[PDB]
């Protein structure tokens, strides 16, 4: 509180603006069907960014 | 004093192959868990105990107000006045109250302070700000002894260095040897540093501070020595104690002479870290530990042997150290019986531990790649270059 | 060759088959296990923090709010120049840590005489007036001082130095106790001498040995320690110290790693006071200064001028028998057999500094403790310089 | 009334004001921002502030004596 300094409210977790604005809010408009190629170096991708994320069971 | 801390539950790894002795043996823990939290529950359904003094501590918490700012006593004057630093680094002349526990005022301790008319109103031996509590360890890491393949020398020595000392230490003074205040972990990167910190800090009977060197270093001025020293100080308040400091050249380069700020800041700090480490005798229960990669580019002043004695080289895996690496990452692996594993620990390359265990992931992947689990040796052939990226041939031959 | 990603089908297969009959109950147990560990801990609570409260009948809470509602709390200060007071000019400018400076007037309860520059002096709120002077005071358990009045240390417990410790000899011996050879020869005694080498050379040790056969109580002056938080008042500090240096009946003044302090705002107000403390102090006194520093060039020049530092002593590493000597020196605290060939391990071990051999001594008992022997022998010394020499 | 009532908040709104960064959103009418004064407050937003605009370190001007972000 103002000055008497009494807890009155709990608020969100601290993360500072800096580091709160590198979140991807607005997701950019960029599709595996607009890459040439890559479609190796896309499975490589996936299989490390994905397939833990969607299946850590195997 | 008080203790030492860092509670694990049970190592289990008992069996590993879910043939219902782990589900008898996880059931055991699972059921005392219950019992914990039952008891614990029921404890406080039924519970009735407070007030009891009640008026006395009324009136003392009235001249005690609200809110009570906490203050470093800096310095002491006569049995009825001392100097005190509020947290912005201003210090007053302030008055000490009677209920006060005058054998309790020490400088350093964190003394509760009246919000108008500074006055000494409490003391506060559990400061312990946020940082310093977060370095501590609580949930120790699942890694091992039995985690670790090859190491031997180095692990004997770490175990000489900080738990020879804390458990019967009487060998030392028989023979008349201080011990070992202070080891360093050094040797090229992914070699086994910090998985011997985590396998220290598991079969441990002290507090482990687990420090990443650069976390001690902070913007405000005089914040990092004060960081410094506080997480030393829990270190001796919590003895014995064992403190690692991993990335010990985010701190500890070659001196020089500063002239902006902040790396004067920074030197500041290292003279701080490295006067608190004399500071504490080598008899004394607190023992650290720092890692690091580029060990050429330490101060000469923060390995003295006054200082740091002890230095374990972690050296690239040899080829028996290969293989007891390769037994331990592929233990958990439903591995055919084609595989061989010999022909890459055979390849003369600069395979670390984490490069094997890599190997072992990218094996374990291209089998699923296949559809199957059984990870073939085909499946390490291929995983071998495929982990390995990057002598003109006929030179040296 | 194009690899398929795993389909739905393939990932629910995966999922079983492959399976040990005993996945399921496994995983949901330690998932359990977690939960109750994470319940447990947030409902453990935390216990109260015991606050510093005296035991009861301690209390005088009356007279805590006589005092609460009374007395006030005085902000303290680094008084500053005195402004040429002359008593129609009373004001100084006062520093409140952090906080800004102020030319604040005496109260009626000081007087000036009482009041001089940098010292700390508690100032009211209302109109910052220097309410009463208070002294840093001196206390062995605060800083980190003299601490010693006669060193454990003798000539005995320094070896390889033989031509080093006659230099000190002639400087600190001679003129303390036969003041009458330099009285009658009409020589000032020396002033002041450097023990300049490389670290670990011996220099702190060799400094407190003489200090003890000396008969003079030997003073511990870490630089860094003033450098960090012990820094400001340090010259008051330090004028403490040698006053009571006046008061004992003979002090040895030696600053630990003045590499530290050599090399300025309150390092040169520092090293001015020891110009008040060894040029306005008298050249005759028992109090000699002690210098030793890493780097020798780093002392200031003007410290070193004549008629302030009359020696320059140079720290080198031990010979072949200075070598054995410090083995045999530090060895003799441990358990060894009687037949250790030291000369041996002082010529396995060249150009090594003296912590580099007691760290040797501590490798070798090291090494006996490993084959859990309670004698080392020269095997256990050999693999040890083999250790920690060579690197 | 209301007219007066819509008077003093547009008045709320006058100047001088400190600048902040509005941190995070907690309410549909609390937020708490960093004034560059160099403290964090939990103060109140304006009703009449379009909420969409109120992104993650926006710079916001907030009431000199209340710090509500106006
Ligand atoms: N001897 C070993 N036996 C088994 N695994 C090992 C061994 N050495 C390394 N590893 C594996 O290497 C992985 C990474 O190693 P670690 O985190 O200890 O690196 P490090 O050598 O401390 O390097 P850095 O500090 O430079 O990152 C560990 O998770 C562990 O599985
Ligand atoms: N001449 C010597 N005789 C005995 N011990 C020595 C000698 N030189 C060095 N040492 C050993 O070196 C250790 C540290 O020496 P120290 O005085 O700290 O070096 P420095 O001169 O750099 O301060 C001491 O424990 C001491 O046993
Ligand atoms: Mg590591």
């Known amino acids: 509180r103002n000055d008497s300094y009494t807890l009155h409210k709990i608020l969100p977790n601290k993360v500072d603006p800096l580091v709160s604005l590198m979140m991807v809010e607005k997701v950019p408009d960029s599709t595996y069907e607009m890459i040439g190629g890559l479609d190796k170096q896309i499975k490589e991708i996936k299989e490390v960014i994905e397939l833990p994320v969607k299946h850590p069971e195997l | 004093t008080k203790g030492p801390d860092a509670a694990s539950k049970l190592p289990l790894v008992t069996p590993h192959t879910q043939c219902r002795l782990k589900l008898l043996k996880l059931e055991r823990i ?156 050094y040797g090229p990167p992914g070699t086994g540093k910090t998985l011997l910190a985590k396998a220290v800090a598991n079969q441990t009977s002290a507090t482990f501070l687990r420090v990443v060197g650069s976390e001690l270093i902070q913007k405000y001025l005089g914040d990092g020595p004060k960081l410094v020293r506080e997480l030393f100080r829990v270190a001796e308040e919590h ?47 607190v023992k650290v530990i720092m890692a690091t990669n580029r060990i050429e580019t330490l101060d000469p002043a923060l390995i003295r042997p006054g200082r740091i004695d002890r230095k374990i080289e972690f050296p690239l895996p040899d080829e028996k150290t290969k293989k007891r690496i390769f037994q331990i990452h592929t233990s958990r692996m439903t591995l055919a019986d084609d595989v061989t594993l010999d022909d890459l620990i055979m390849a003369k390359d600069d395979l670390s531990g984490a490069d094997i265990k890599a190997i072992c992931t990218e094996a374990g992947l291209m089998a699923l790649r296949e559809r199957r689990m059984k990870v073939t040796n085909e499946d390490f052939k291929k995983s071998k270059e495929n982990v390995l990226y990057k002598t003109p041939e006929g030179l040296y031959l | 060759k194009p690899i398929r990603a795993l389909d739905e089908g393939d ?49 005088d809470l009356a007279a805590d709010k006589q005092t609460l509602q009374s007395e006030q709390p005085l902000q303290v200060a680094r008084c500053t120049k005195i402004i040429n007071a002359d008593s129609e000019d009373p004001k100084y400018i006062i520093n409140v840590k952090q906080f800004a400076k102020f030319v604040v007037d005496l109260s009626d309860q000081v007087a000036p005489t009482d009041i001089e520059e940098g010292m700390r002096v508690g100032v009211d709120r209302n109109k910052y007036q220097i309410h009463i002077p208070l002294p840093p005071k001196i206390d062995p358990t605060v800083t980190m001082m003299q601490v010693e009045e006669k060193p454990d240390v003798t000539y005995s417990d320094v070896g390889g130095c033989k031509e080093q410790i006659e230099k000190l000899r002639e400087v600190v011996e001679t003129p303390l106790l036969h003041p009458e050879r330099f ?64 008061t004992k009946k003979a002090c040895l003044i ?67 028998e200075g070598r054995t000597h410090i083995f045999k020196i530090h060895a003799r605290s441990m358990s060894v057999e009687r037949d250790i060939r030291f000369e041996l391990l002082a010529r396995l071990c060249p150009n090594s500094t003296g912590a580099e051999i007691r760290s040797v001594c501590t490798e070798a008992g090291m090494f006996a403790i490993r084959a859990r022997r309670k004698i080392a022998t020269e095997k256990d010394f050999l693999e040890a310089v083999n250790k920690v020499i060579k690197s | 009334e209301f007219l007066h009532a819509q008077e003093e908040v547009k008045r709320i709104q006058s100047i001088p004001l400190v600048i902040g960064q509005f941190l995070e959103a907690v309410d549909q009418n609390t937020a708490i921002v960093g004034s560059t004064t160099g403290s964090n407050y939990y103060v109140r937003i304006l009703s009449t502030i379009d909420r969409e605009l109120l992104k993650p370190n926006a710079s916001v001007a907030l009431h000199k004596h209340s710090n509500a972000l106006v």
């Open chain 3, 183 to 246: 009285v009658n020869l009409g020589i000032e005694p020396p002033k002041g001498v450097l023990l300049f080498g490389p670290p670990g050379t011996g220099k702190t040790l060799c400094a407190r040995a003489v200090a003890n056969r000396t008969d003079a109580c030997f003073i511990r002056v870490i630089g860094s320690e003033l450098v960090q938080k012990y820094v400001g008042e340090g010259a008051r500090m330090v004028r403490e110290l040698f006053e009571m240096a006046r």
């Open chain 3, 254 to 320: 030696f600053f630990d790693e003045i590499d530290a302090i050599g090399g300025d705002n309150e390092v040169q107000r520092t090293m001015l006071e020891l110009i008040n403390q060894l040029d306005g102090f008298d050249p005759r006194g028992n109090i000699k200064v002690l210098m030793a520093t890493n780097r020798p060039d780093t002392l200031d020049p003007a410290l070193m001028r004549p008629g302030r530092l009359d020696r320059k002593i140079e720290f080198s590493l031990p010979d072949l």
């Open chain 2, 30 to 185: 699972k059921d005392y868990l219950l019992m914990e939290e039952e008891f614990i529950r029921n404890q406080e359904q039924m519970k009735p105990l407070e007030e009891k003094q009640e008026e006395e501590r009324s009136k003392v918490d009235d001249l005690r107000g609200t809110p009570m700012s906490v203050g470093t006593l800096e310095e002491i004057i006569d049995d009825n006045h001392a100097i005190v630093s509020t947290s912005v680094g201003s210090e007053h002349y302030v008055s000490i109250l009677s209920f006060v526990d005058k054998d309790l005022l020490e400088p350093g301790c964190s003394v509760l302070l009246n919000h108008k008319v500074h006055a000494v109103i409490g003391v506060l031996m559990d400061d312990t700000d946020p940082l310093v509590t977060v370095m501590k360890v609580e949930k120790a890491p699942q890694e091992t002894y039995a985690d670790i393949g090859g190491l031997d020398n180095q692990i004997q020595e770490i175990k000489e260095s900080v738990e020879l000392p804390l458990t019967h230490p009487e060998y030392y003074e028989e023979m008349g040897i201080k011990p070992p205040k202070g080891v360093i972990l």
């Open chain 2, 239 to 285: 003895a014995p104690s064992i403190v690692f400091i991993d990335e010990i050249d985010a701190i500890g380069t070659k001196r020089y002479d500063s002239n902006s700020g902040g790396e004067r800041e920074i030197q500041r700090t290292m003279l701080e870290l490295l006067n608190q480490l004399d500071g504490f005798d080598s008899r004394g229960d």
């Open chain 3, 11 to 59: 990932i629910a297969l995966l999922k079983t088959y492959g399976q040990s009959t005993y996945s399921r109950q496994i995983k949901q147990v330690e998932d359990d296990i977690q939960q109750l560990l994470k319940k447990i801990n947030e409902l453990t609570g935390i216990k109260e923090s015991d606050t510093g409260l005296a035991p009861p009948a301690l209390w």
